[PDB]
Amino acid sequence: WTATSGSCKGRCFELQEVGPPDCRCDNLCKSYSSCCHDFDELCLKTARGWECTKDRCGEVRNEENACHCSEDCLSRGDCCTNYQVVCKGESHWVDDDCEEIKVPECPAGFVRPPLIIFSVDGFRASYMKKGSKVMPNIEKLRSCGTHAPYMRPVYPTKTFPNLYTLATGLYPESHGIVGNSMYDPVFDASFHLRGREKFNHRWWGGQPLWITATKQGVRAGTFFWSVSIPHERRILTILQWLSLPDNERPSVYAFYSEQPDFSGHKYGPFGPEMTNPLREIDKTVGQLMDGLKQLRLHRCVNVIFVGDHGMEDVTCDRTEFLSNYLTNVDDITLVPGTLGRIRAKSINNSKYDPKTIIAALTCKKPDQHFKPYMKQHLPKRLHYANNRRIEDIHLLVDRRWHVARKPLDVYKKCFFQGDHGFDNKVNSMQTVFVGYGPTFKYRTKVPPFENIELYNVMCDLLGLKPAPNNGTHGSLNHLLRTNTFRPTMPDEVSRPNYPGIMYLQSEFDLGCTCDDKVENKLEELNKRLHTKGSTKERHLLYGRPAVLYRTSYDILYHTDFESGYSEIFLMPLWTSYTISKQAEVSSIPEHLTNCVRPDVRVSPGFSQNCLAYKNDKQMSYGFLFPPYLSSSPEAKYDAFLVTNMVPMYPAFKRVWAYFQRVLVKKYASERNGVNVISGPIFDYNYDGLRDTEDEIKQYVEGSSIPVPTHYYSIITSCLDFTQPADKCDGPLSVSSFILPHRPDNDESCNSSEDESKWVEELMKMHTARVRDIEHLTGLDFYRKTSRSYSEILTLKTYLHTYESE
Ligand SMILES: *[C@@H]1O[C@H](CO)[C@@H](O[C@@H]2O[C@H](CO)[C@@H](O[C@@H]3O[C@H](CO[C@H]4O[C@H](CO)[C@@H](O)[C@H](O[C@H]5O[C@H](CO)[C@@H](O)[C@H](O)[C@@H]5O[C@H]5O[C@H](CO)[C@@H](O)[C@H](O)[C@@H]5O)[C@@H]4O)[C@@H](O)[C@H](O[C@H]4O[C@H](CO)[C@@H](O)[C@H](O)[C@@H]4O[C@H]4O[C@H](CO)[C@@H](O)[C@H](O)[C@@H]4O)[C@@H]3O)[C@H](O)[C@H]2NC(C)=O)[C@H](O)[C@H]1NC(C)=O
Ligand SMILES: O=C(c1cc(OCC2CCOCC2)nc(C2CC2)c1)N1C[C@@H]2CN(C(=O)c3ccc4[nH]nnc4c3)C[C@H]2C1
Ligand SMILES: [Ca+2]
Ligand SMILES: [Cl-]
Ligand code: NA
Ligand SMILES: [Zn+2]
16 A cells, blocks of 8 residues: 555655655655656656757747756756757767876765666676677777676575675675575565565665665665656656755765667577667666766766676577476476575475485486486585575576476576576676776776676775675775775784694504615705794795684694694695696505505604504595605605595595696696696585584594585685796796595596596586685685785686686
8 A cells, every 4th residue: 555646746756765654756666656646747758858958949848748858957967868968069078089087077966986886687798899890889988998807696696686796895695696686585575576575674684875875965866767667767867866056965876777688588698689779778878977067077076887687508409307206296496497405395204305306317318408406516616605595406407508407497488688697707697897087097907807896896986985795805906096995904803833853752542554664974964944933935825824713723834834733624725836847746656555654753642543444334434635746766755644634435536537647737837837826615504604523523433533525725826837836936827726525426427437537526516716715714815915905815716717708
C-alpha cells in the first residue's frame, strides 16, 4: 500500500526518501510501485526529444519539453546537452584536443572535485580495441586519462556479485551476494533478479560507497535507476543535481547502463548487432561530457568508466545435463548455467550424500565440460567458500558451456548466444577501467588489476576513509596524480630466536635413521659460517618475512636455504632459497633415500618424529627445500634435517616431487635464476585466513604434527631477465600458487599419466597472489627491497593467470 495520492511538482528526483505511505518522486519509486500519480507527467517529460535544433535557439521556455534550448536554461541548469554547440557555436567535447588537467578547475563553491561513476554492463575488455572506430568519446577518455588494458571481475562473473563488489571492495563470500540467484538456509528464502526479495536489506552485507560517503558527511546522488527511466533522462538528472546549491549538491554520482550486456546475451559478444549498442553507449558518454563542458565542470569532475564483467559465446546445444550422470537427479536442486551449485532438494532426506554425487560427476566422460568440487577445494584465488549461501558442491564450467539439470529445463525455460559467469581468470570475462579527471594521471597506462581494489580508490577520490575491505590500500596509488593514501608496513609481532647447537644426537628418540656416519679444519670454519647465516644474502633476497601474529619460532640457516621454524606447528612457516640459472639438478643418492636426521639446534620436544609417519598408513612426508637441488653432496645432508620435513599424502607427493625436481630448474632457466619461498598452509574453516592451533581438524596419527590443507610457493626473479635473480637492480617479477594438499588426484582427470601431462596444468589452475598467501599464513613478504612500498603492494596483488593474449 501507498497513499499514491500526493504530488511531485518541484520534487522531481528528490534526494532523501519519504516514509510509506507518503507517495515517492525519487529514481527508484517505479521499482517500488510508489511514485505519485503525476510522476510520469512532471518528472518524465519527453516532448521534443533530447537535442537542440537551430530553430529552437532562443525559444520561449516551455515547461513541457524534456530539455530546453531557451536563454535561461544554463542558469535553470536544464539545457539539452548539445545547447551550446547548436545555439552558441561551441564545439563537442570529443572534437577538443586534450590538454593535461594539472589542477582541478572548478566553479566557486565546489569543495572537492565530484566523482561520476559511469558503469556499463557486459562491457568486455577487448571492446576498447575492437569497437574503437565507433566509440570516439570513450576512446578520448581512455587515451587522455588513466587506463588498464583490462580489469579482472570477481567470481562468479555475474552482475549482482560484481556490482556489489565494486560498491564495497568485498569478495562476494563476505558481502553476501554470492550469485544472481541464491538460497539462504537460515532465512529459508531465495533471491532472484526478478521479484521483491532482493529488496530486503538482510541479503546485503559490507558497507557500500554511498553509505560510507553519507556516514562521513559527503552527500551521494542515488546510484540506482529504475529500468524504464531512459538514459538521456538519467544524464539530465545528474546534470541538474550538479546545479544544486553548494549545501544540497551531492559529491558522488552513478550512472548505470544495461547495455551492452542485454544485447550480448542475444547476439553473442561480437555479433553484427553489437555495433549499435556500442555507438549508443558512446553517444550517452558524449552527452555527459558535453553537459559537463556547458557547466564548466569538464576539467573539474573525475569520471570512472568501469564494467562489471565481460561476455562469451554460449549456445543451447553447448549444455551438459546432469541427468546424463546422476540416477537420483530428482533429490537434487541445481542452481544452473555458467556455474553450478547443488544442494539436496529436501533436508528431511538422510539418504542424501555429497560424496557419491561428486564421484558420480568426476571424470565420467572423455571431453566433460564442467568439473565438480567441494567448495573448500575450489582454487583459493576465487575466494568462493566462506558463506552459508554457497552450496557445498560446486561445478566450474568450461568457458562456452552451460550445465543444466535435465533437458526439459532447457526447452521449457535457442534463446541466447552469449553468457557470462565463468572463472574470473577467463579472457572473455575480463572487463574495462578508465579514469579521467584532475585526480587521475594524464595519458597513462597502468597494469591490469582486480575490481575489489576500486572501492579504496573511490574513497581516496572523495577524501573518505574506506570501511575494512579486501582491497590492499595503496596498491593502486600509481593510478592517481595526488590524494594518495600513504601506506605503511605492518609491524612484526613475533621476533625469531636464533638457536645454536644445544642438543646431542642421543637426546633424540624420533625413530629416524640416516646412513651418514662418514667422517680437515679448512672445510670446518666454513660449514659453521653457513649455520651463522654467511650465505643468507644469496638465499634471502628481500628480507625475512614478518610474522604478524604471536607465536614462537626460530630462524635456521643452511648452506642452501634458510627457514623460519615454528615450535608450535612443528614445521617451518616458510623456507627461502635461490636457484640460479646455472644450477644443477642431482638425484637422491640411494643410501640417503630414507634419511631423516635430528636438528641439534632444536629440541626433541619441538620436533616431528619418524614413528608417527610409519604408524600413519595415510600420511607420508616431504621436504620444503628439495634434496634434488643441493649445491653439493655435503650440503645435501641439510635437506634431510627433520626441521625441513612436512606431512604429505602419497598422491600429493607426486605433484610436489615433480614441482621440485623439474619445474624449479625450468623456471630458473627461463627467468634467469629464481628465488623460492615455500611453506605450509592451514585453512580448515576455508575463510581464507590463517588457522590458529585450536582450529586444526587433522594430525598425523598419534602426534601433535598438524596436517596442512595446502602448500604455497612464491617464485620471484628480476623483471629484466638479463639480470640474474640474485643481482637485480630494478623491478621484480613474481608468480605463486597455493596447491590443495589432497589425498587423491581426482581433480586431474589425466593423473594416471606421467606428471609431465598434468601436474603443471593443476598448478596453473591454483595460481595465486602473494597477498592471498599473506592472508593464509599471517606473514608479510618483501620487507627489504630497494623498491617503493606502493610498487611492492602492486607486486603482491599481481596474479599470473596463464591465459593467452
Ligand atoms: C575480506 O574483508 C572482510 C572485511 O574486512 C574480512 O571479513 C572480516 O573478518 C573478520 C574476521 O573473521 C570478522 O570479524 C568478526 O566479526 C564478528 C561480528 O561482526 C559483525 O559486525 C560487522 C561490523 O559492522 C559486520 O561486517 C558483520 O557482517 C557479517 O555478517 C552478516 C550475517 O550475520 C552478513 O549480512 C554480512 O554480509 C557479513 O557476513 C560475512 O561475515 C561473517 C563473519 O562475521 C561470516 O560468518 C559470513 O560467512 C559472511 O561471509 C557482523 O554482523 C565478531 O563478532 C567476531 O568476533 C569473534 O572472534 C574474536 C577474535 O578476535 C573474539 O574477540 C570474540 O570472542 C568473537 O568470538 C565469539 O564469536 C564467535 C562467532 O559467533 C563464537 O564462535 C565464539 O565462541 C565467541 O562467542 C569477529 O571479529 C568480520 O566480521 C569480517 N567482515 C566482513 C564484512 O565479512 C575478510 O576476512 C576479508 N577476506 C579475506 C580472505 O581477507
Ligand atoms: O541499477 C542497478 C544497480 C547498479 C549498481 O551500481 C553499483 C555501482 C557501485 C559503484 O561502482 C559502479 C557500480 N548496483 C546495483 C546493486 C549492487 C547494488 C544495482 N541495476 C539495475 C539493473 C537490472 N539488471 C538487469 O536487468 C540484468 C542485467 C544484466 C544481466 N545479465 N544476466 N542477467 C541480467 C539482468 C542489472 C541491474 C543493476
Ligand atoms: Ca582459516
Ligand atoms: Cl548465480
Ligand atoms: Na605413512
Ligand atoms: Zn548478463
